[model samples]
Target: KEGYLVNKSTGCKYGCLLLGKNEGCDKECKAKNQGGSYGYCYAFGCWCEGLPESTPTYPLPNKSCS
Candidate 1:
């Protein structure tokens, strides 16, 4: 109810959910997963979507920051 499920790094990791999702769901919320979306993976364990007050986890493959 306070945070979202996430996987920090890509070392063939896996996760399990218990409480499910809270509010702010735009679409019909179905199954819950540690991996937020198919496009990007979150930090290790459960965390929010935006970047925290720490170093970035993953770097851009090709896209440049502007």
Candidate 2:
């Protein structure tokens, strides 16, 4: 993956009900990110695949899927 998956905003809107995410993800990422290849909605947030040139401070990893 040459790009980054940065989550800046989130909320189920215009997204497919089955996907459980809001819509406009693609548009949002493409517009917000400096260089966005695409954007997807996650369970808790949105992931924008874009160049690292405009990456945000990533949050640390976690391990508590239980």
lDDT tens digits by residue: candidate 1, 1-66: 223222234322222233233233311121243223322222332233433333222222333221
**Tens digits of per-residue lDDT for model 2, 5-33:** 34334312222223322356556644554
Poorest 10 consecutive residues by lDDT, candidate 1 = 22-31
RMSD for each of the candidates: 12.0, 6.6
How accurate locally is residue 52 in candidate 2, as Cα lDDT from 0 to 100? 55
Model 1 stretches astray by more than 4 angstroms: 1-10, 19-47, 52-66
TM-score of candidate 1 to 2 decimals: 0.18
Candidate 2 lDDT for residue 53: 52
lDDT of 2: 0.41
Whole-model alpha-carbon lDDT for candidate 1:
0.27
Question: Could you tell me which 10 consecutive residues in candidate 2 have the lowest summed lDDT?
Answer: 57-66
